[PDB]
Amino acid sequence: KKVVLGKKGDTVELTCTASQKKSIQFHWKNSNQIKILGNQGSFLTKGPSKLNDRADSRRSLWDQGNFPLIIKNLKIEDSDTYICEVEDQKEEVQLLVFGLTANSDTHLLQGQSLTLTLESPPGSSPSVQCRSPRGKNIQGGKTLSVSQLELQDSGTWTCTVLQNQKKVEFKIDIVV
Amino acid sequence: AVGIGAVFLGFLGAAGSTMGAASMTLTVQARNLLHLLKLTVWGIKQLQARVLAVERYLRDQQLLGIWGCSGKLICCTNVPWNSSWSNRNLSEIWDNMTWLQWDKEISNYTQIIYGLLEESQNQQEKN
Amino acid sequence: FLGAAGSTMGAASMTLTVQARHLLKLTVWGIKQLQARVLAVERYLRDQQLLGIWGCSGKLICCTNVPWNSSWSNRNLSEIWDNMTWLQWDKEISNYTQIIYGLLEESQNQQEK
Amino acid sequence: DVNAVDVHGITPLHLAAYFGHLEIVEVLLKTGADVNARDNRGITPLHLAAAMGHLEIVEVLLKAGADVNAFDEAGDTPLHLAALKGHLEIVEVLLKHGADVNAQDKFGKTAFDISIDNGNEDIAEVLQKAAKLN
Amino acid sequence: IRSENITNNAKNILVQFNTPVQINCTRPNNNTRKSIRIGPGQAFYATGDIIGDIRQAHCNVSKATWNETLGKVVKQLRKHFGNNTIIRFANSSGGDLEVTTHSFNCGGEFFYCNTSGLFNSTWISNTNDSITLPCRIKQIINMWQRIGQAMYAPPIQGVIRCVSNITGLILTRDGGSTNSTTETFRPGGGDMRDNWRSELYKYKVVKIEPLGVAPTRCKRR
Amino acid sequence: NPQEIHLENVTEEFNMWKNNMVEQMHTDIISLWDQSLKPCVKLTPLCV
Amino acid sequence: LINCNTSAITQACPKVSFEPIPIHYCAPAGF
Numbered sequence: 001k002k003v004v005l006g007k008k009g010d011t012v013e014l015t016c017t018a019s020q021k022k023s024i025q026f027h028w029k030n031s032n033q034i035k036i037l038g039n040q041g042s043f044l045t046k047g048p049s050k051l052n053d054r055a056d057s058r059r060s061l062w063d064q065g066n067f068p069l070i071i072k073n074l075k076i077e078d079s080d081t082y083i084c085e086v087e088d089q090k091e092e093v094q095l096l097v098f099g100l101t102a103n104s105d106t107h108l109l110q111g112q113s114l115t116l117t118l119e120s121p122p123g124s125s126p127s128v129q130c131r132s133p134r135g136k137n138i139q140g141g142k143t144l145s146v147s148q149l150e151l152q153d154s155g156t157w158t159c160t161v162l163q164n165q166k167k168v169e170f171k172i173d174i175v176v
Numbered sequence: 177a178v179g180i181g182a183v184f185l186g187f188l189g190a191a192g193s194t195m196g197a198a199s200m201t202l203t204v205q206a207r208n209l210l211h212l213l214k215l216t217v218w219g220i221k222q223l224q225a226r227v228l229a230v231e232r233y234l235r236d237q238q239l240l241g242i243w244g245c246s247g248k249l250i251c252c253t254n255v256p257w258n259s260s261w262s263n264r265n266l267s268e269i270w271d272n273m274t275w276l277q278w279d280k281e282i283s284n285y286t287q288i289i290y291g292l293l294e295e296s297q298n299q300q301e302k303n
Numbered sequence: 304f305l306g307a308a309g310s311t312m313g314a315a316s317m318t319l320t321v322q323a324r325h326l327l328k329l330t331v332w333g334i335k336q337l338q339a340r341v342l343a344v345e346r347y348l349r350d351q352q353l354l355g356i357w358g359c360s361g362k363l364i365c366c367t368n369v370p371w372n373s374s375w376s377n378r379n380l381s382e383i384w385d386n387m388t389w390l391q392w393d394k395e396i397s398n399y400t401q402i403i404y405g406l407l408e409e410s411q412n413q414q415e416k
Numbered sequence: 417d418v419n420a421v422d423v424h425g426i427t428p429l430h431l432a433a434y435f436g437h438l439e440i441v442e443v444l445l446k447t448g449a450d451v452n453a454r455d456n457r458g459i460t461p462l463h464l465a466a467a468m469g470h471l472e473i474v475e476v477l478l479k480a481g482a483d484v485n486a487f488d489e490a491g492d493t494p495l496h497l498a499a500l501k502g503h504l505e506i507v508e509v510l511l512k513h514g515a516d517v518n519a520q521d522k523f524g525k526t527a528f529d530i531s532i533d534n535g536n537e538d539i540a541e542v543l544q545k546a547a548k549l550n
Numbered sequence: 551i552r553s554e555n556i557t558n559n560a561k562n563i564l565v566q567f568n569t570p571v572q573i574n575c576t577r578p579n580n581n582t583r584k585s586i587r588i589g590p591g592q593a594f595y596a597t598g599d600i601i602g603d604i605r606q607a608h609c610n611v612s613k614a615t616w617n618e619t620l621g622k623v624v625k626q627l628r629k630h631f632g633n634n635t636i637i638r639f640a641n642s643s644g645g646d647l648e649v650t651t652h653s654f655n656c657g658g659e660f661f662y663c664n665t666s667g668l669f670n671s672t673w674i675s676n677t678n679d680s681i682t683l684p685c686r687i688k689q690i691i692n693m694w695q696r697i698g699q700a701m702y703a704p705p706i707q708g709v710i711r712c713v714s715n716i717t718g719l720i721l722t723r724d725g726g727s728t729n730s731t732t733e734t735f736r737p738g739g740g741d742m743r744d745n746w747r748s749e750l751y752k753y754k755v756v757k758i759e760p761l762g763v764a765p766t767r768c769k770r771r
Numbered sequence: 772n773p774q775e776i777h778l779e780n781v782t783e784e785f786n787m788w789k790n791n792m793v794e795q796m797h798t799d800i801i802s803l804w805d806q807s808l809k810p811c812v813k814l815t816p817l818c819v
Numbered sequence: 820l821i822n823c824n825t826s827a828i829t830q831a832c833p834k835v836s837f838e839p840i841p842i843h844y845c846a847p848a849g850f
């Protein structure tokens with residue numbers, strides 16, 4: 001029951017597991033049993049889904065026994081389970097995609113408040129732990145707000161989002 | 177595969193027939209047994225197939241003649257039949273069953289059958 | 304059939320029962336392989352035709368009632384089965400090989416009678 | 417053959433630059449294909465690389481020493497065909513590799529005039545920036 | 551139709567035809583259009599035209615015969631599913647060019663044919679034209695034998711022609727949990743073992759054990 | 772001349788997807804295509 | 820970083836004629 005996390009725009013590598021080392025037929029299905037990829041001989045066959053143009057695989061690893069899943073331009077509606085069908089296995093992975101940002105882009109001053117915005121996928125409750133170069137280790141739930149924003153709080157704050165003992169880091173645009 | 181390789185599948189006919197009929201027709205089926213690149217390169221391959229058929233036939237005939245039945249299609253041997261191998265009547269096997277299902281029955285036992293036949297022939301030659 | 308000759312007499316007597324179970328270039332070598340296989344089969348059938356006289360046809364281990372002189376073996380014969388191999392034993396009785404074959408064939412002749 | 421030529425002067429490097437296969441381009445470069453192959457119609461692999469919009473093969477060819485100001489029978493630079501099909505990134509690639517903005521074809525068509533006749537404004541602005549910094 | 555497993559979208563569905571669908575195809579001997587271009591980019595336009603017309607071909611398929619064949623196919627395919635359920639075809643979803651397009655060789659020259667105009671269909675239950683498929687010759691081919699790519703010799707200038715049957719068909723069902731309706735079928739293939747299974751479908755190799763052992767009432771010696 | 776013998780009363784499983792016959796046909800066709808069609812450029816990935 | 824280096828082979832490539840022919844498979848002796 002492995003789970004991986006995204007950064008809403010990067011790439012995620014989901015791998016299967018094989019041992020016969022013969023480039024056996026495999027596929028990729030979600031929880032609705034919709035095809036995503038699949039090996040037909042030595043070619044690549046993209047499945048008829050909403051993940052058509054951005055899904056990819058590393059063809060050089062197929063003879064070794066690894067069948068990866070590379071997804072570019074990651075978005076929040078793709079947070080769903082995925083199934084490997086190498087031989088007769090039914091190994092499953094979970095993808096957790098969210099985004100953390102702010103509302104004020106550039107227009108900020110000295111001595112105001114700061115607000116965050118986290119778009120969590122439906123069916124999750126992550127925890128945001130912020131870390132500041134000034135030492136403001138803000139602990140809280142999903143939504144976080146900072147009541148002080150002055151000149152010494154400049155720099156990109158690293159608010160990491162943890163769930164299921166797995167955490168990923170982000171950046172915060174502060175223009176004063 | 178002409179000749180001996182043809183008669184390896186020659187007795188394959190009537191495989192689903194009655195157990196008592198095939199054993200009588202073994203004798204009849206055995207009685208029924210009877211340009212540059214073509215002859216230098218192509219001919220030696222059919223020669224290999226024919227000599228492989230002859231080698232297989234002599235290997236099978238030698239394995240049959242271990243038990244004192246050289247040249248005999250049907251031979252009776254003094255090995256007693258253990259009841260654990262079959263535990264069934266003599267009538268129903270020869271009146272109902274076929275050869276394929278019977279070898280599916282005795283595939284577990286035929287390995288020790290061949291060894292006990294070899295040991296019985298060895299004991300016959302010892303006395 | 305010449306393999307596993309390092310074993311002794313009593314071991315070979317058991318293992319014989321175990322034994323019971325560029326185009327012109329390729330053609331001229333395959334034809335010599337065919338000579339080897341066909342003359343091996345022909346020698347096997349010739350030896351079986353020879354053995355059919357002695358009554359042991361088709362049988363690897365046989366027994367006869369042919370009398371054996373103590374002068375041919377010239378040995379107590381108890382220790383030839385465990386520590387002495389076949390190759391030395393064939394050279395022991397190489398001078399006396401044809402007369403015992405002649406003894407077998409006439410012995411089978413009164414066995415017919 | 418690596419340097420194979422047909423009756424039309426078209427090389428396998430021309431085909432690999434047209435169809436956008438980077439691996440075949442790199443492999444033919446490693447085996448020793450001509451980076452400045454000339455045909456009967458004056459087209460080098462750099463024109464076919466620039467016109468279709470494949471930045472990788474353009475970088476690979478310009479990193480091997482292809483002529484940045486190659487002239488065909490029509491006098492067109494690869495920058496002209498880069499700006500004709502609306503490929504902006506290719507245009508600052510050949511401006512980073514040193515293409516002349518004042519080059520003329522056999523009809524009198526500049527890359528600025530190519531960009532403004534095609535209604536392409538962002539190409540014209542960045543090449544005017546490059547010509548101002550020349 | 552033959553499959554490992556109906557109602558599993560991973561396995562291919564091989565379809566065998568009782569009647570052959572004749573497909574015939576040609577490469578033209580020379581260029582026919584020879585367009586004249588005055589505007590800028592004329593040298594690249596002429597070079598693209600000659601290098602595109604050196605590799606262009608078309609395949610003709612009889613429309614009525616292939617339509618009646620797929621009319622048999624849809625009636626056979628409605629047996630394994632519901633009769634009232636609408637089933638229909640679609641073109642290839644995406645992937646490599648050997649999967650998205652038809653790939654076959656004539657005289658050592660590779661043809662990639664666009665079968666999107668062929669598989670256009672829709673069907674509702676209880677209710678001399680010749681179609682042309684544009685085919686292009688691609689030099690860069692993903693090998694079916696091994697992972698990798700290959701580039702071969704440029705095509706021969708002479709006219710090349712292939713007239714051939716259509717014996718079998720390869721399908722992948724889009725498995726979908728959307729009301730069990732509008733079952734779409736897309737062409738697949740690429741694994742050549744599936745191609746050899748479509749002709750070696752009724753054959754099995756066995757060895758012979760002629761030695762038999764039986765009990766009886768006989769006696770020996 | 773082919774020899775073809777028809778059986779009378781027989782019922783045998785003819786599972787063809789697990790056929791071992793194909794995993795030989797496929798290797799024979801790979802051998803044929805490797806002997807016959809030699810490409811001008813052949814690229815294959817090799818991983819350590 | 821996993822070492823995955825593509826190997827390229829340049830070979831002489833003449834023109835050949837392609838025509839598939841019907842082939843049978845024959846079982847060996849005893850089969």
Ligand SMILES: *[C@@H]1O[C@H](CO)[C@@H](O[C@@H]2O[C@H](CO)[C@@H](O[C@@H]3O[C@H](CO[C@H]4O[C@H](CO)[C@@H](O)[C@H](O)[C@@H]4O)[C@@H](O)[C@H](O[C@H]4O[C@H](CO)[C@@H](O)[C@H](O)[C@@H]4O[C@H]4O[C@H](CO)[C@@H](O)[C@H](O)[C@@H]4O[C@H]4O[C@H](CO)[C@@H](O)[C@H](O)[C@@H]4O)[C@@H]3O)[C@H](O)[C@H]2NC(C)=O)[C@H](O)[C@H]1NC(C)=O
Pocket residue numbers: 654655656657658706707708709710711712713714715834835836837838839
């Ligand atoms: C399914 O099966 C079917 C049938 O089983 C397949 O259909 C077959 O497809 C084949 C591929 O095209 C095709 O083969 C061609 O046939 C041509 C005609 O053959 C007849 O004429 C010749 C000569 O008179 C006779 O010897 C022969 O017995 C026939 O009666 C051949 O001419 C073709 O050979 C040419 O092409 C190959 C392609 O690689 C060359 O290697 C070869 O050297 C030949 O090259 C000549 O022609 C080309 C093109 O014209 C020229 O560029 C070249 O320089 C040569 O030119 C000479 O000859 C031409 C006249 O052709 C002349 O003008 C010139 O001056 C030169 O003298 C080729 O062999 C089958 O006919 C066809 N079968 C049927 C029944 O239609 C189908 O493909 C299969 N499906 C799949 C998917 O494979």
Ligand SMILES: *[C@@H]1O[C@H](CO)[C@@H](O[C@@H]2O[C@H](CO)[C@@H](O[C@@H]3O[C@H](CO)[C@@H](O)[C@H](O)[C@@H]3O)[C@H](O)[C@H]2NC(C)=O)[C@H](O)[C@H]1NC(C)=O
Pocket residue numbers: 555556557558
């Ligand atoms: C052939 O295809 C059928 C589909 O028609 C396969 O049957 C499917 O098998 C899976 C795994 O056994 C089933 O998933 C299970 O579903 C139950 C709820 O129904 C759930 O509680 C389990 O945890 C599991 O996820 C699936 O339902 C089932 N589908 C159907 C329609 O029966 C079958 O495995 C394939 N292979 C063979 C050899 O038959």
Ligand SMILES: *[C@@H]1O[C@H](CO)[C@@H](O[C@@H]2O[C@H](CO)[C@@H](O[C@@H]3O[C@H](CO)[C@@H](O)[C@H](O)[C@@H]3O)[C@H](O)[C@H]2NC(C)=O)[C@H](O)[C@H]1NC(C)=O
Pocket residue numbers: 641642643644650651664666
């Ligand atoms: C199967 O058929 C469909 C439709 O008949 C084909 O879809 C077409 O796909 C191409 C690209 O693959 C689309 O072109 C795109 O247009 C957008 C427009 O904004 C452009 O931004 C893209 O860069 C690209 O040029 C085309 O629009 C689309 N057709 C339709 C009607 O949506 C599909 O390619 C066919 N598949 C096969 C394997 O033949």
Ligand SMILES: *[C@@H]1O[C@H](CO)[C@@H](O[C@@H]2O[C@H](CO)[C@@H](O[C@@H]3O[C@H](CO)[C@@H](O)[C@H](O)[C@@H]3O)[C@H](O)[C@H]2NC(C)=O)[C@H](O)[C@H]1NC(C)=O
Pocket residue numbers: 651664665666667
């Ligand atoms: C196989 O044939 C079908 C149609 O017979 C092809 O679908 C057509 O593909 C072209 C280009 O991919 C589409 O043109 C597009 O038009 C939009 C809007 O004008 C434009 O923005 C795009 O840049 C592109 O030019 C076209 O709409 C689409 N459909 C039809 C009905 O023509 C298909 O692409 C062919 N397969 C292959 C592999 O080429």
Ligand SMILES: *[C@@H]1O[C@H](CO)[C@@H](O[C@@H]2O[C@H](CO)[C@@H](O)[C@H](O)[C@H]2NC(C)=O)[C@H](O)[C@H]1NC(C)=O
Pocket residue numbers: 258259260
């Ligand atoms: C028939 O075969 C069974 C074994 O399949 C024999 O059973 C053995 O009998 C001896 C005593 O007679 C026991 O010591 C063994 O433990 C038994 N089992 C085995 C596996 O040897 C049985 O004796 C045989 N009967 C005849 C008449 O030969």
Ligand SMILES: *[C@@H]1O[C@H](CO)[C@@H](O[C@@H]2O[C@H](CO)[C@@H](O)[C@H](O)[C@H]2NC(C)=O)[C@H](O)[C@H]1NC(C)=O
Pocket residue numbers: 629633
């Ligand atoms: C769906 O269509 C099939 C067509 O094959 C119907 O099958 C027929 O069923 C009747 C009644 O059992 C038989 O007499 C016919 O021989 C069948 N075949 C044909 C070709 O008519 C089937 O009944 C239909 N309905 C369902 C619910 O499956």
Ligand SMILES: *[C@@H]1O[C@H](CO)[C@@H](O[C@@H]2O[C@H](CO)[C@@H](O)[C@H](O)[C@H]2NC(C)=O)[C@H](O)[C@H]1NC(C)=O
Pocket residue numbers: 666667670
């Ligand atoms: C696939 O089929 C659809 C309809 O099922 C076609 O769409 C129509 O095409 C005709 C002729 O091109 C147009 O006159 C219509 O306006 C189209 N739309 C409708 C709603 O009828 C489509 O062109 C077909 N595609 C191919 C490649 O054959």
Ligand SMILES: *[C@@H]1O[C@H](CO)[C@@H](O[C@@H]2O[C@H](CO)[C@@H](O)[C@H](O)[C@H]2NC(C)=O)[C@H](O)[C@H]1NC(C)=O
Pocket residue numbers: 570713714715
């Ligand atoms: C395509 O299918 C047709 C069947 O309609 C084939 O025609 C038959 O070919 C066999 C093979 O020699 C002949 O024995 C028959 O007499 C032919 N029948 C007719 C009606 O002509 C045709 O040969 C097939 N095409 C190919 C290339 O095999």
Ligand SMILES: *[C@@H]1O[C@H](CO)[C@@H](O)[C@H](O)[C@H]1NC(C)=O
Pocket residue numbers: 193194779780
């Ligand atoms: C096959 O079975 C039928 C069933 O009645 C029987 O009549 C027929 O004789 C059998 N075939 C043979 C060769 O015995």
Ligand SMILES: *[C@@H]1O[C@H](CO)[C@@H](O)[C@H](O)[C@H]1NC(C)=O
Pocket residue numbers: 265268
């Ligand atoms: C075996 O045969 C005997 C005598 O014919 C009979 O009494 C017995 O019921 C039979 N047993 C079975 C299992 O057929």
Ligand SMILES: *[C@@H]1O[C@H](CO)[C@@H](O)[C@H](O)[C@H]1NC(C)=O
Pocket residue numbers: 268272
């Ligand atoms: C013969 O075998 C069949 C199948 O095992 C069985 O149904 C039938 O009763 C048997 N008949 C006799 C007479 O034993």
Ligand SMILES: *[C@@H]1O[C@H](CO)[C@@H](O)[C@H](O)[C@H]1NC(C)=O
Pocket residue numbers: 283284
């Ligand atoms: C024979 O061996 C097979 C091996 O799998 C076993 O399944 C079967 O039960 C055995 N039969 C008997 C009668 O021992």
Ligand SMILES: *[C@@H]1O[C@H](CO)[C@@H](O)[C@H](O)[C@H]1NC(C)=O
Pocket residue numbers: 371372373
């Ligand atoms: C030994 O050989 C002689 C012949 O030289 C023979 O007469 C005799 O019977 C043989 N046997 C014995 C025990 O002497």
Ligand SMILES: *[C@@H]1O[C@H](CO)[C@@H](O)[C@H](O)[C@H]1NC(C)=O
Pocket residue numbers: 379381
């Ligand atoms: C032969 O060996 C046995 C056993 O050691 C011995 O009793 C006998 O005396 C020996 N005979 C001769 C002639 O050496």
Ligand SMILES: *[C@@H]1O[C@H](CO)[C@@H](O)[C@H](O)[C@H]1NC(C)=O
Pocket residue numbers: 394395396398
């Ligand atoms: C066999 O006869 C030859 C003839 O001279 C002799 O030299 C040899 O020693 C004999 N072998 C024996 C007696 O074992």
Ligand SMILES: *[C@@H]1O[C@H](CO)[C@@H](O)[C@H](O)[C@H]1NC(C)=O
Pocket residue numbers: 580581582
């Ligand atoms: C090209 O093909 C056309 C077909 O109409 C023909 O008229 C013309 O002479 C051809 N040109 C050549 C072979 O140069």
